[PDB]
Write an enzyme that holds these catalytic residues in place. Structure first.
Site, PDB file in Angstrom:
ATOM      1  N   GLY A 221       8.614   4.281   0.282  1.00 20.81           N
ATOM      2  CA  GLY A 221       9.576   5.472   0.402  1.00 20.81           C
ATOM      3  C   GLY A 221      10.895   5.216   0.778  1.00 20.81           C
ATOM      4  O   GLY A 221      11.213   4.010   1.344  1.00 20.81           O
ATOM      5  N   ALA A 222      11.762   6.163   0.659  1.00 19.90           N
ATOM      6  CA  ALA A 222      13.358   6.159   1.115  1.00 19.90           C
ATOM      7  C   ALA A 222      13.301   5.574   2.642  1.00 19.90           C
ATOM      8  O   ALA A 222      14.261   4.912   2.834  1.00 19.90           O
ATOM      9  CB  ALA A 222      13.769   7.511   1.216  1.00 19.90           C
TER      10      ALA A 222
ATOM     11  N   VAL B 172       4.948  -0.246   3.185  1.00 21.99           N
ATOM     12  CA  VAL B 172       3.998  -0.640   3.842  1.00 21.99           C
ATOM     13  C   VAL B 172       3.207  -1.772   3.195  1.00 21.99           C
ATOM     14  O   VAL B 172       2.874  -1.537   2.004  1.00 21.99           O
ATOM     15  CB  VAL B 172       2.995   0.667   4.304  1.00 21.99           C
ATOM     16  CG1 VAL B 172       2.037   0.085   5.481  1.00 21.99           C
ATOM     17  CG2 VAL B 172       4.052   1.781   4.966  1.00 21.99           C
TER      18      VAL B 172
ATOM     19  N   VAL C  83       0.787  -1.271  -0.016  1.00 17.57           N
ATOM     20  CA  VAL C  83       0.026  -0.052  -0.078  1.00 17.57           C
ATOM     21  C   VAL C  83       0.721   1.270  -0.017  1.00 17.57           C
ATOM     22  O   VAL C  83       0.313   2.375  -0.227  1.00 17.57           O
ATOM     23  CB  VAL C  83      -1.131   0.038   1.285  1.00 17.57           C
ATOM     24  CG1 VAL C  83      -2.156  -0.853   0.598  1.00 17.57           C
ATOM     25  CG2 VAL C  83      -0.619  -0.255   2.355  1.00 17.57           C
ATOM     26  N   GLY C  84       2.147   1.291   0.077  1.00 18.86           N
ATOM     27  CA  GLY C  84       2.826   2.599  -0.289  1.00 18.86           C
ATOM     28  C   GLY C  84       4.446   2.208  -0.084  1.00 18.86           C
ATOM     29  O   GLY C  84       4.896   1.257   0.912  1.00 18.86           O
TER      30      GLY C  84
ATOM     31  N   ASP D  34       1.686   9.739  11.473  1.00 23.78           N
ATOM     32  CA  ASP D  34       2.648  10.283  10.339  1.00 23.78           C
ATOM     33  C   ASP D  34       2.946   9.330   9.495  1.00 23.78           C
ATOM     34  O   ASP D  34       3.652   8.008   9.806  1.00 23.78           O
ATOM     35  CB  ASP D  34       3.709  10.842  11.265  1.00 23.78           C
ATOM     36  CG  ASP D  34       4.469  11.598  10.424  1.00 23.78           C
ATOM     37  OD1 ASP D  34       4.576  11.553   9.058  1.00 23.78           O
ATOM     38  OD2 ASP D  34       5.062  12.859  10.710  1.00 23.78           O
TER      39      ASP D  34
ATOM     40  N   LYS E 248       4.622  -1.988   8.615  1.00 20.59           N
ATOM     41  CA  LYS E 248       5.789  -1.086   8.009  1.00 20.59           C
ATOM     42  C   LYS E 248       7.272  -1.925   8.159  1.00 20.59           C
ATOM     43  O   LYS E 248       7.544  -2.078   9.121  1.00 20.59           O
ATOM     44  CB  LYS E 248       5.884   0.225   8.373  1.00 20.59           C
ATOM     45  CG  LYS E 248       6.863   0.976   7.649  1.00 20.59           C
ATOM     46  CD  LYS E 248       6.843   2.599   7.840  1.00 20.59           C
ATOM     47  CE  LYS E 248       6.918   2.985   9.453  1.00 20.59           C
ATOM     48  NZ  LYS E 248       7.157   4.620   9.343  1.00 20.59           N
TER      49      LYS E 248
HETATM   50  C1  LIG Z   1       2.396   0.748   9.913  1.00 25.67           C
HETATM   51  C2  LIG Z   1       2.803   2.079  10.424  1.00 25.67           C
HETATM   52  C3  LIG Z   1       4.165   1.842  11.470  1.00 25.67           C
HETATM   53  C4  LIG Z   1       4.527   3.152  12.262  1.00 25.67           C
HETATM   54  C5  LIG Z   1       3.924   4.332  11.645  1.00 25.67           C
HETATM   55  N1  LIG Z   1       4.497   5.429  12.360  1.00 25.67           N
HETATM   56  C6  LIG Z   1       3.602   6.706  12.580  1.00 25.67           C
HETATM   57  O1  LIG Z   1       2.563   6.763  12.316  1.00 25.67           O
HETATM   58  C7  LIG Z   1       4.465   7.769  13.508  1.00 25.67           C
HETATM   59  C8  LIG Z   1       5.758   7.948  13.319  1.00 25.67           C
HETATM   60  C9  LIG Z   1       6.262   8.913  14.022  1.00 25.67           C
HETATM   61  N2  LIG Z   1       5.353   9.795  14.915  1.00 25.67           N
HETATM   62  C10 LIG Z   1       4.329   9.619  14.946  1.00 25.67           C
HETATM   63  N3  LIG Z   1       3.305  10.643  15.709  1.00 25.67           N
HETATM   64  C11 LIG Z   1       4.132  11.825  16.092  1.00 25.67           C
HETATM   65  C12 LIG Z   1       3.145  12.444  17.422  1.00 25.67           C
HETATM   66  O2  LIG Z   1       1.965  12.305  17.015  1.00 25.67           O
HETATM   67  C13 LIG Z   1       1.411  11.077  17.163  1.00 25.67           C
HETATM   68  C14 LIG Z   1       1.972  10.291  15.739  1.00 25.67           C
HETATM   69  C15 LIG Z   1       3.378   8.765  14.127  1.00 25.67           C
HETATM   70  C16 LIG Z   1       2.890   4.507  10.670  1.00 25.67           C
HETATM   71  C17 LIG Z   1       2.367   3.154  10.339  1.00 25.67           C
HETATM   72  C18 LIG Z   1       1.405   3.266   9.182  1.00 25.67           C
HETATM   73  C19 LIG Z   1       0.124   2.886   9.574  1.00 25.67           C
HETATM   74  C20 LIG Z   1      -0.870   2.635   8.511  1.00 25.67           C
HETATM   75  C21 LIG Z   1      -0.749   3.060   7.147  1.00 25.67           C
HETATM   76  C22 LIG Z   1      -1.796   2.747   6.093  1.00 25.67           C
HETATM   77  O3  LIG Z   1      -3.104   2.449   6.495  1.00 25.67           O
HETATM   78  N4  LIG Z   1      -1.515   2.762   4.740  1.00 25.67           N
HETATM   79  C23 LIG Z   1      -2.483   2.706   3.783  1.00 25.67           C
HETATM   80  C24 LIG Z   1      -2.350   3.535   2.568  1.00 25.67           C
HETATM   81  C25 LIG Z   1      -3.471   4.423   2.228  1.00 25.67           C
HETATM   82  C26 LIG Z   1      -2.827   5.084   2.961  1.00 25.67           C
HETATM   83  C27 LIG Z   1       0.506   3.236   6.833  1.00 25.67           C
HETATM   84  C28 LIG Z   1       1.615   3.518   7.819  1.00 25.67           C
END
Ligand SMILES: Cc1ccc(NC(=O)c2ccnc(N3CCOCC3)c2)cc1-c1ccc(C(=O)NCC2CC2)cc1
Length: 349
Positions: free
Chosen positions: A30-31, A35, A27-28, A165, A50
């Site tokens: 990058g560098a 995912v 689904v995604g 994020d 991820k």
């Molecule tokens: C699997 C995963 C693992 C880790 C992170 N990381 C974060 O979300 C993250 C990384 C760094 N900081 C934050 N914060 C900062 C402070 O505020 C709270 C969140 C959040 C995101 C994901 C993630 C989760 C879901 C998805 C996803 O659903 N992708 C589908 C595509 C249609 C868009 C993609 C990536």
């Protein structure tokens, strides 16, 4: 004990994951990572997995890996992404090379909502209430998001919201250049590197998001950094002496003084038809001087949210030690700290 792992290639990338995760679908990419959507047969949940890209290839990358893992292991709040699982196929520190993070699959974002749906005042109340409830929690731990925008806000079918994020790459100069949503939500003091910033940058961004939910249109869609500054000052007014003094960049200060003075506009004439309580909250969020902006905790008690506010159900975070941010360490040292955190993870109940 150790689950059984299986292997597969998806888009010239090897994925090695526990058997419980089935139906991996890209689904995604990058560098900084790739995912896949999957089905977790153990919990019955749709999940996102991820795989970090080159997690330990430099000091920079290795510190960033440790940083994300520490942050996700800490966040435990309904309106904030949490960590369901973290794993590696490695059986020892010696062979440790890949890191996989698992969360709820966050299948629709707020961009999709604003683009494709009619939002009522009550919808705006519920959505902004949830973002502020999550921000009170994150800010309580001295965590600053710095990149809040509609694409980082996941919203399910019942209109329930989480802050995340999705960034899988770096905010470079080129990335912030021109007519781009990557810059439209950013507080002016970071856009233009005016001074040391702090958690109040996130409140500017919420103000921008709330205005767009109300009107259906981007608040400050600048064609570049300077055009965007002009859009902002036309609305909120050019700065006074008090704010000018706080711009520690002599260069930035001299440029902003070259501009013809403008007064703050009448927000009731900008947001025609909006709830007066919504107009009042926007005036308190969209303040140039970050010292004077309303905080998340303060905003939750604003009359606009009377229907949702419960002071006994707006929790804060446990203490978050980020002394590591000041620390200089070698790659194998950051890698060992990360390993300890993988090994010690305990799943949610
Ligand atoms: C699997 C995963 C693992 C880790 C992170 N990381 C974060 O979300 C993250 C990384 C760094 N900081 C934050 N914060 C900062 C402070 O505020 C709270 C969140 C959040 C995101 C994901 C993630 C989760 C879901 C998805 C996803 O659903 N992708 C589908 C595509 C249609 C868009 C993609 C990536």
């Amino acid at each position: 004990e150790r689950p059984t792992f299986y292997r597969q290639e998806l888009n010239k990338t090897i994925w090695e994951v526990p058997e419980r995760y089935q139906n991996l679908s890209p689904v995604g990419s990058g560098a900084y990572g790739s995912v896949c959507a999957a089905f977790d047969t153990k919990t019955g949940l749709r999940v996102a997995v991820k795989k970090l890209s080159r997690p330990f290839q430099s000091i920079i990358h290795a510190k960033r890996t440790y940083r994300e893992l520490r942050l996700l292991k800490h966040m435990k709040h309904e309106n904030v992404i949490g960590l369901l699982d973290v794993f590696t196929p490695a059986r020892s520190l010696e062979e440790f090379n890949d890191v996989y993070l698992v969360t709820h699959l966050m299948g629709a974002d707020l961009n999709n909502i604003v683009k494709c749906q009619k939002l009522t005042d009550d919808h705006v109340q519920f959505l902004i209430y949830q973002i502020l409830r999550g921000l009170k929690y994150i800010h309580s731990a001295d965590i600053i998001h710095r990149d809040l925008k509609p694409s980082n806000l996941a919203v399910n079918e019942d209109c329930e919201l989480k802050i995340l994020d999705f960034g899988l790459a770096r905010h470079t100069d080129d990335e912030m250049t021109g007519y781009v949503a990557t810059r439209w939500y950013r507080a002016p003091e970071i856009m233009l590197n005016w001074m040391h910033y702090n958690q109040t940058v996130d409140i500017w961004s919420v103000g921008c998001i709330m205005a767009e939910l109300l009107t259906g249109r981007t608040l400050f869609p600048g064609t570049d950094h300077i055009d965007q500054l002009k859009l902002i000052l036309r609305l909120v007014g050019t700065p006074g002496a008090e704010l000018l003094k706080k711009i520690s960049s002599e260069s930035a200060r001299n440029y902003i003084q070259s501009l013809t003075q403008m007064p703050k506009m009448n927000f009731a004439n900008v947001f025609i038809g909006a709830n007066p309580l919504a107009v009042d909250l926007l005036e308190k969020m969209l303040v140039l001087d970050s010292d004077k902006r309303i905080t998340a905790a303060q905003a939750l008690a604003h009359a606009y949210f009377a229907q949702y506010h419960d002071p006994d159900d707006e929790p804060v975070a446990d203490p978050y030690d980020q002394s590591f941010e000041s620390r200089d360490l070698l790659i194998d040292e950051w890698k060992s700290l990360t390993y300890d955190e993988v090994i010690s993870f305990v799943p949610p109940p």
